[PDB]
Amino acid sequence: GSMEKLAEIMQEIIEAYQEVKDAFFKFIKAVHEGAPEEELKKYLEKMKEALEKMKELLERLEKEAKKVIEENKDKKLELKVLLMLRLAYLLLKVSIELTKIAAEKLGDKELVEELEKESKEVEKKIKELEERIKKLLEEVDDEELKEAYKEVEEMEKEAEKFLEKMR
């Protein structure tokens, strides 16, 4: 069913995130050696193709999350599903910002422009989700979910600290 489907999409999002990371760290290693630009551009292309994949999977996650919510109209399930979406968009945000860092080093100005748009859009979606999630925290009485919210919060803080160290 759709709860399995949500988890399955999440696995595909995490896998595409991993491809972005793998390409980014190989890109950074290659750029510090002075690798030829065709290899650098390969890794940037790999990040872009995986980002495209993640963007589409997030649209599937989102359209599937919405059906599960509203069909269930359950607070705990909605909170669970928004926290999954909250995690997926964090992974997308990291993936965008890593590709942006690579695009900037390679001087790919049009990709950097497009990634600027994607990162503001994901920031906006993250802030919308934070607003809904904070509302449900009052409404649910499962401290496991409250710990899960605290965890993704600490994930984003560490991810931002990591992103600043890269650029």
């Binding site: 709860m3 696995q11 896998e15 995130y17 999954m84 979910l145 991810a159």
Partner: peptide, 22 residues
Amino acid sequence: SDYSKYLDSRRAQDFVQWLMNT
């Protein structure tokens, strides 16, 4: 020095698996 356990994709998988099984 740069590695963050929080960026780990296995951690994200385990976090989903935890969150999903709550």
